[PDB]
Design a protein around this motif. Structure first.
Motif, PDB file in Angstrom:
ATOM      1  N   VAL A   1      10.344 -43.258  26.070  1.00 51.97           N
ATOM      2  CA  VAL A   1      11.403 -42.587  25.332  1.00 51.97           C
ATOM      3  C   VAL A   1      11.237 -41.073  25.318  1.00 51.97           C
ATOM      4  CG1 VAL A   1      12.462 -42.272  23.094  1.00 51.97           C
ATOM      5  CG2 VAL A   1      11.844 -44.551  23.867  1.00 51.97           C
ATOM      6  N   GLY A   2      10.096 -40.605  24.831  1.00 49.73           N
ATOM      7  CA  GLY A   2       9.804 -39.186  24.790  1.00 49.73           C
ATOM      8  C   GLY A   2       9.746 -38.576  26.176  1.00 49.73           C
ATOM      9  N   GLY A   3       9.490 -39.417  27.173  1.00 50.41           N
ATOM     10  CA  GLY A   3       9.521 -38.987  28.556  1.00 50.41           C
ATOM     11  C   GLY A   3      10.877 -38.422  28.922  1.00 50.41           C
ATOM     12  N   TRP A   4      11.898 -38.812  28.166  1.00 47.75           N
ATOM     13  CA  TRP A   4      13.225 -38.253  28.348  1.00 47.75           C
ATOM     14  C   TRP A   4      13.214 -36.784  27.970  1.00 47.75           C
ATOM     15  N   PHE A   5      12.545 -36.456  26.870  1.00 48.34           N
ATOM     16  CA  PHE A   5      12.426 -35.061  26.471  1.00 48.34           C
ATOM     17  C   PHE A   5      11.250 -34.428  27.191  1.00 48.34           C
ATOM     18  CE2 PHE A   5      10.773 -31.662  23.739  1.00 48.34           C
ATOM     19  CZ  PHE A   5      11.890 -30.863  23.634  1.00 48.34           C
ATOM     20  N   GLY A   6      10.484 -35.247  27.892  1.00 48.05           N
ATOM     21  CA  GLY A   6       9.344 -34.735  28.622  1.00 48.05           C
ATOM     22  C   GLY A   6       8.035 -35.000  27.915  1.00 48.05           C
ATOM     23  N   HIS A   7       8.064 -35.877  26.921  1.00 47.14           N
ATOM     24  CA  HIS A   7       6.823 -36.308  26.314  1.00 47.14           C
ATOM     25  C   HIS A   7       6.326 -37.580  26.964  1.00 47.14           C
ATOM     26  CE1 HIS A   7       7.007 -33.306  23.168  1.00 47.14           C
ATOM     27  NE2 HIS A   7       8.213 -33.709  22.817  1.00 47.14           N
ATOM     28  N   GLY A   8       5.258 -37.455  27.739  1.00 48.43           N
ATOM     29  CA  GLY A   8       4.537 -38.607  28.236  1.00 48.43           C
ATOM     30  C   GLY A   8       3.264 -38.683  27.433  1.00 48.43           C
ATOM     31  N   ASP A   9       3.029 -37.627  26.670  1.00 47.44           N
ATOM     32  CA  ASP A   9       1.857 -37.541  25.829  1.00 47.44           C
ATOM     33  C   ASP A   9       2.205 -38.064  24.459  1.00 47.44           C
ATOM     34  N   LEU A  10       3.463 -38.443  24.288  1.00 45.04           N
ATOM     35  CA  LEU A  10       3.903 -38.977  23.016  1.00 45.04           C
ATOM     36  C   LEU A  10       3.153 -40.261  22.737  1.00 45.04           C
ATOM     37  N   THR A  11       2.490 -40.299  21.592  1.00 47.77           N
ATOM     38  CA  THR A  11       1.711 -41.454  21.191  1.00 47.77           C
ATOM     39  C   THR A  11       1.942 -41.694  19.719  1.00 47.77           C
ATOM     40  OG1 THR A  11      -0.244 -40.118  20.698  1.00 47.77           O
ATOM     41  CG2 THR A  11      -0.066 -41.025  22.911  1.00 47.77           C
ATOM     42  N   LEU A  12       1.871 -42.949  19.300  1.00 43.89           N
ATOM     43  CA  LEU A  12       2.045 -43.268  17.897  1.00 43.89           C
ATOM     44  C   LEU A  12       0.974 -42.559  17.098  1.00 43.89           C
ATOM     45  CD1 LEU A  12       3.422 -44.807  15.628  1.00 43.89           C
ATOM     46  CD2 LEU A  12       1.893 -46.715  16.103  1.00 43.89           C
ATOM     47  N   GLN A  13      -0.198 -42.433  17.704  1.00 47.11           N
ATOM     48  CA  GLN A  13      -1.297 -41.689  17.118  1.00 47.11           C
ATOM     49  C   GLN A  13      -0.855 -40.305  16.698  1.00 47.11           C
ATOM     50  OE1 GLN A  13      -1.237 -43.403  19.786  1.00 47.11           O
ATOM     51  NE2 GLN A  13      -2.987 -44.796  19.878  1.00 47.11           N
ATOM     52  N   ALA A  14      -0.326 -39.561  17.660  1.00 47.05           N
ATOM     53  CA  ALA A  14       0.081 -38.186  17.434  1.00 47.05           C
ATOM     54  C   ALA A  14       1.140 -38.113  16.357  1.00 47.05           C
ATOM     55  CB  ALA A  14       0.591 -37.573  18.717  1.00 47.05           C
ATOM     56  N   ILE A  15       2.038 -39.085  16.374  1.00 46.74           N
ATOM     57  CA  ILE A  15       3.121 -39.122  15.415  1.00 46.74           C
ATOM     58  C   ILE A  15       2.574 -39.263  14.015  1.00 46.74           C
ATOM     59  CG2 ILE A  15       5.134 -40.330  14.628  1.00 46.74           C
ATOM     60  CD1 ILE A  15       5.446 -41.316  17.533  1.00 46.74           C
ATOM     61  N   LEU A  16       1.745 -40.278  13.830  1.00 42.98           N
ATOM     62  CA  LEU A  16       1.144 -40.545  12.540  1.00 42.98           C
ATOM     63  C   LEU A  16       0.379 -39.335  12.057  1.00 42.98           C
ATOM     64  CD1 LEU A  16      -0.134 -44.156  13.159  1.00 42.98           C
ATOM     65  CD2 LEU A  16       1.900 -43.451  11.914  1.00 42.98           C
ATOM     66  N   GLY A  17      -0.371 -38.728  12.965  1.00 45.64           N
ATOM     67  CA  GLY A  17      -1.150 -37.553  12.635  1.00 45.64           C
ATOM     68  C   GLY A  17      -0.260 -36.451  12.125  1.00 45.64           C
ATOM     69  N   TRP A  18       0.849 -36.256  12.818  1.00 45.07           N
ATOM     70  CA  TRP A  18       1.796 -35.238  12.429  1.00 45.07           C
ATOM     71  C   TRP A  18       2.367 -35.586  11.066  1.00 45.07           C
ATOM     72  CZ3 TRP A  18       2.858 -30.503  14.068  1.00 45.07           C
ATOM     73  CH2 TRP A  18       4.038 -29.890  13.638  1.00 45.07           C
ATOM     74  N   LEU A  19       2.407 -36.875  10.751  1.00 41.01           N
ATOM     75  CA  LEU A  19       3.013 -37.310   9.504  1.00 41.01           C
ATOM     76  C   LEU A  19       2.111 -37.137   8.290  1.00 41.01           C
ATOM     77  CD1 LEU A  19       5.271 -38.488   7.946  1.00 41.01           C
ATOM     78  CD2 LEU A  19       4.477 -40.758   8.522  1.00 41.01           C
ATOM     79  N   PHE A  20       0.858 -37.562   8.395  1.00 39.95           N
ATOM     80  CA  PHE A  20      -0.057 -37.475   7.261  1.00 39.95           C
ATOM     81  C   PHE A  20      -0.836 -36.171   7.238  1.00 39.95           C
ATOM     82  CE2 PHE A  20       0.454 -42.086   7.632  1.00 39.95           C
ATOM     83  CZ  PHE A  20       0.706 -42.422   6.326  1.00 39.95           C
ATOM     84  N   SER A  21      -0.622 -35.343   8.254  1.00 39.98           N
ATOM     85  CA  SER A  21      -1.269 -34.042   8.331  1.00 39.98           C
ATOM     86  C   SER A  21      -1.219 -33.258   7.026  1.00 39.98           C
ATOM     87  CB  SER A  21      -0.652 -33.204   9.444  1.00 39.98           C
ATOM     88  OG  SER A  21      -1.220 -31.911   9.456  1.00 39.98           O
ATOM     89  N   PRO A  22      -0.062 -33.239   6.346  1.00 41.67           N
ATOM     90  CA  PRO A  22      -0.107 -32.548   5.059  1.00 41.67           C
ATOM     91  C   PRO A  22      -1.095 -33.186   4.104  1.00 41.67           C
ATOM     92  CG  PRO A  22       2.142 -32.828   5.749  1.00 41.67           C
ATOM     93  CD  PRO A  22       1.316 -33.619   6.704  1.00 41.67           C
ATOM     94  N   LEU A  23      -1.026 -34.502   3.979  1.00 44.02           N
ATOM     95  CA  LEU A  23      -1.914 -35.200   3.073  1.00 44.02           C
ATOM     96  C   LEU A  23      -3.335 -35.067   3.566  1.00 44.02           C
ATOM     97  CD1 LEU A  23      -2.424 -36.827   0.656  1.00 44.02           C
ATOM     98  CD2 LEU A  23      -2.069 -38.890   1.979  1.00 44.02           C
ATOM     99  N   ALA A  24      -3.481 -35.064   4.882  1.00 43.35           N
ATOM    100  CA  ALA A  24      -4.775 -34.857   5.495  1.00 43.35           C
ATOM    101  C   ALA A  24      -5.340 -33.520   5.070  1.00 43.35           C
ATOM    102  CB  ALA A  24      -4.665 -34.928   6.997  1.00 43.35           C
ATOM    103  N   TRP A  25      -4.462 -32.565   4.822  1.00 42.75           N
ATOM    104  CA  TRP A  25      -4.909 -31.244   4.445  1.00 42.75           C
ATOM    105  C   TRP A  25      -5.246 -31.185   2.969  1.00 42.75           C
ATOM    106  CZ3 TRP A  25      -3.196 -27.265   1.278  1.00 42.75           C
ATOM    107  CH2 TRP A  25      -3.794 -26.025   1.499  1.00 42.75           C
ATOM    108  N   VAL A  26      -4.387 -31.786   2.153  1.00 42.28           N
ATOM    109  CA  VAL A  26      -4.531 -31.761   0.703  1.00 42.28           C
ATOM    110  C   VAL A  26      -5.918 -32.172   0.266  1.00 42.28           C
ATOM    111  CG1 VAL A  26      -3.759 -32.738  -1.466  1.00 42.28           C
ATOM    112  CG2 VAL A  26      -2.110 -32.241   0.325  1.00 42.28           C
ATOM    113  N   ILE A  27      -6.447 -33.178   0.940  1.00 40.43           N
ATOM    114  CA  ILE A  27      -7.745 -33.729   0.605  1.00 40.43           C
ATOM    115  C   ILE A  27      -8.874 -32.789   0.979  1.00 40.43           C
ATOM    116  CG2 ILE A  27      -6.915 -36.050   0.795  1.00 40.43           C
ATOM    117  CD1 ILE A  27      -8.035 -36.162   3.529  1.00 40.43           C
TER     118      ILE A  27
END
Ligand SMILES: CCCCCCCCC(CCCCCCCC)(CO[C@@H]1O[C@H](CO)[C@@H](O[C@H]2O[C@H](CO)[C@@H](O)[C@H](O)[C@H]2O)[C@H](O)[C@H]1O)CO[C@@H]1O[C@H](CO)[C@@H](O[C@H]2O[C@H](CO)[C@@H](O)[C@H](O)[C@H]2O)[C@H](O)[C@H]1O
Lengths: 408, 410, 421
Positions: free
Chosen positions: B271-297
């Protein structure tokens, strides 16, 4: 073109084996056969179908790849190449190489059902089949699933219909399941021979073929209806659950395989035990089976010279897991063998041995399927061997169709 | 650092936000819990005598585990020997053969201890301390006290008489601490995985008062409370077997999850390969998502990018998948280098059973024990997960505080 | 050879005496039956271990079974490929021998096999015959006999199922006889396991055939018959249908059953061994004060059961060892014992054990008698006869003792007939 003739011989065998020839729905069976060969040419010869076949095989290659990744994790290096590097062919370890993929496809199965995908594809394809050849919805469902997922895993979705279904429908599920090649076993061969699209087409030929021969034995009685706790909360619950189920199923399968193979070995020992008495010794069951299925071996269009070996292999196919048959098979495809490929015989053997006719698969299906409907146990197990012969003939018909497209 | 107090405040706040009745809470209790948790935090992770004691503990337990691997060495033979590494390199480490047998062993061992009555005593004691300071009921107290050591199927032996008659709050407490803690089994598993042991220990002890904390923050008690093996050999056996089926279930679960995640990342790659993300991973997504909370701690941003991914994988998938990707970084050969306090915070935040599947587990098992309340269970549902998660989190913040405050280690 | 046989008979007398001491009621011990059993046991001992035709039958048996095992190993070869190959030996050395892969599968296989042979009707036949013999000479109940017979082949794996109608209502002595016979017995399944571990096959075979009447022996010595047996016209069997549908379904059911058995056994061993290492750790540490930190559980037990070991004919030099092993048998289980027994068998051993001793131990270790098997009896029987469960639990220890003594006597006999050969 002994092929058509062969087909005739096969169907003749069915009739001979059939319980009731007067109840046969021709509008069903003939249509089934038609569909089988139609799809055959469809994916293979004429209509550039090998393309979508190719995309499919690619996709599935990626699937098998993913499973292989998970396994590579869980079992570490025992699945790596170094095993070959040391042990050689023996480095291939079936237990680790294949059985886990049962867990994988089981999980995936559950996942899709949680999503609603399998629901869709089963509804559609089964819808089609039921529409054309008029078989009941349930058996259609099963045969539908069998294309995608495996025989082991398939019965999980017929459970509301099992207690309900007749002798016939049941036998259909049994047979079709046996003849089916998908999921675990598919990946299994991919690990070894890896002719992806061959196996694909083998599946698509198998399902309706199973339907065919199943209705050439126990064609019809009465009718059936749907019948409606612990259900998956989230996708993860599903994944894990189906995983565990598939796991213990896999364990069962393994145990079974070990058992039966060992038993057949014991039977060789028995044969020899009598023979050395009788003065004529060193006799292999393999040769016996060879002589036994030899005519049948020829009928399908295999030249005599090659038909001896072929027949042997098929005997092994029925009484032993297909994989052993495959072992001696490639033992013939290796150089320095008096036998040739004939560039047909190879192909026609290949498809033939795709499915599971093995007694072990009886034991598996009948066993678990019994667990789901213990009251039907006696019934089920009564029809096991019949089902073997049926699915056998399914794969075989597929092989004949292959023989057809060997020429030019 | 103040940043820690920020984290604390935030978490607690979030707990309050979700509360049924914010005015119904017992401050003595929740603050008691918090204070106890952080007290242990310092006690083990700051004072020299504390870290010493903890180190000795780690050594002892590691000796235990060593005996485990001795039995293992017996069963599977040379397949776990050194020759494997020579042959397969890092692939010579076979997760199944190396780890799961410890689930077996510890299951057995725990059965033994529970039989002899050691755990009886300890649970009695700690439970006592808890109900003394927190004013919790004896049932929930003993529960949280127990959930430290035991787990999985053998866990709810002590709560079974109370459950049907147990309140709505205390139930959610057992649920909470049930999620927050880890069994000794999977713990040892983690050790073998290469996970730092001491932090695991500390976290395990931190869970119970943490579990009780967020349990009481979310669902206070508005209503009043109340209040077989033959010989040792057999017990050891039953424990081993039970543990075995557990191990199998685990292995299958992991294989499944891993392969699925791989498949999905295949899709997203597409899917992301359409925008040019072949590096798109659920990992990266999740990381981007909890990153704020990851920081708060208290995690630095640069490393928070990853911390988010790991914690994410914990929440949505499980702890094993998480640690499995975490240990890659701990290895010396690892490209990316991490701060110490990050190792801490992560290691603590990842110790717990809090995830999606655990829901199903609780529902089913507890239903088998007390089906009448099954409706209540499902009704509560994810709130439990939230509670446990937050317990692990606060613990992690504490960890970051003190480990960042003095020295810690790798 | 004088002192040899003298000491043997001495041992016999000792075991039997100890039996009589612990008997419920010393009076009313039917001699015809017990001495019958004894004499039968020693008879078979004389048969397979001494007279040539005996060793012909036994040798042939061993060969046959060995071939069967080879077939099973062909199956194993199928599953696990190179992992069972010689490459593992040459590469990994002694560690190349993988217990899990080279043993438990055999449990699977023989489970299946015994299921089949039971299905075709062979086992029922053999049982009926042998038990016929036994009930004839001994005068025991039909139930007891059939049981003790069945247990020569199928152990705790499959229920005896011959006694299923009889169990509920049978007397204390019959019950205890079944219990005892159970503990002294060795399943056919677990046998091949012993074999692959390096344990001598003939001694196993002999041990089982000796075991049945031995079990009967000490059962009757401990718990004589004070009441009436059952008549086959007095009973409703029920138990229709159930597991096997047909030969296929048989082989399968046996297969899976054997599998989960094997797994259970695996975890069992894992735990047990590890725990032993742990306890030895503790004992070492504490023992560091009194001056012996090398002190182990093995050592203690060996220092404990030593006299008994001497009594059965093992020399004092080897006493500590023998007693160690048998000790581990009693307090833990058989697999552990054999696991450390085979280490004395290999030619590379640091210790040379006399042939006579090797035999003696080899037998004295054959049986399920232990402190861990009780619960299995309890539950397994409870399913068939719940009202008798208490009665069962009362008799557990005693049964352990019985089977133990059976194995011991058998071992003694062996020790006698080895010095005589
Ligand atoms: C902590 C713990 C229990 C874990 C208890 O030890 C505590 O030690 C402090 C020290 O002052 C005492 O105060 C506290 O009263 C006391 O509770 C750690 O102690 C366990 O037992 C031994 C300490 O008593 C430790 O022994 C270690 O050192 C010994 C040196 O010979 C050896 O036994 C061995 O190296 C090692 O076990 C033990 O590690 C620990 O598990």
């Amino acid at each position: 073109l002994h092929s058509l003739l062969g087909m005739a011989v096969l169907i003749a065998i069915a009739v001979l084996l059939s319980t009731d020839r007067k109840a046969i729905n021709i509008r069903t069976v003939a249509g089934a056969f038609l569909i089988q060969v139609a799809l055959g040419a469809l994916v293979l010869y004429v209509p550039q179908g090998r393309d979508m076949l190719g995309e499919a095989s690619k996709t599935i290659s990626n699937v098998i790849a993913y499973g292989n990744n998970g396994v590579d994790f869980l079992f570490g290096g025992l699945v790596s190449e170094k095993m070959f590097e040391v042990f050689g062919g023996g480095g291939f370890v079936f237990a680790l190489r294949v059985l886990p993929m049962i867990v994988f496809f089981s999980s995936l199965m559950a996942v899709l059902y949680y999503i609603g995908v399998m629901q869709l594809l089963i509804k559609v394809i089964g819808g089609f089949l039921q529409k054309m050849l008029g078989t009941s919805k349930a058996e259609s469902m099963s045969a539908a699933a069998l294309i995608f997922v495996g025989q082991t895993e398939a019965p999980l979705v017929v459970r509301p219909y099992i207690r309900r279904m007749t002798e016939s429908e049941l036998f259909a599920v049994m047979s079709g399941g046996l003849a089916s090649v998908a999921g675990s076993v598919l990946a299994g061969y991919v690990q070894m021979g890896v002719p992806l699209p061959y196996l694909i087409a083998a599946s698509f030929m198998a399902a309706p073929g199973g339907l065919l021969f199943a209705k050439l034995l126990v064609p019809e009685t009465e009718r059936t209806q749907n019948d409606a706790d612990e259900k998956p909360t989230n996708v993860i619950d599903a994944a894990a659950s189906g995983a565990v189920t598939g796991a213990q199923i896999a364990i069962a399968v393994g145990a079974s395989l070990l058992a039966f193979v060992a038993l057949i070995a014991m039977i060789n020992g028995i044969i020899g035990g009598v023979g050395g008495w009788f003065g004529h010794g060193d006799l292999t069951l393999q040769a016996i089976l060879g002589w036994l299925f030899s005519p049948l071996a020829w009928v399908i269009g295999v030249p005599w010279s090659e038909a001896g070996i072929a027949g042997s292999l098929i005997g092994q196919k029925v009484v032993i897991n297909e994989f052993v048959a495959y072992s001696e098979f490639v033992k013939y495809l290796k150089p320095e063998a008096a036998v040739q490929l004939s560039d047909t015989t190879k192909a026609i053997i290949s498809f033939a041995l795709c499915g599971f006719a093995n007694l072990g698969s009886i034991a598996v299906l009948v066993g678990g399927l019994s667990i789901m409907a213990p009251k039907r146990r006696k019934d089920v197990a009564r029809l096991g061997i019949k089902a073997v012969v049926a699915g056998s003939l399914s794969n075989l018909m597929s092989a004949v169709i292959a023989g057809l497209f060997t020429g030019l």
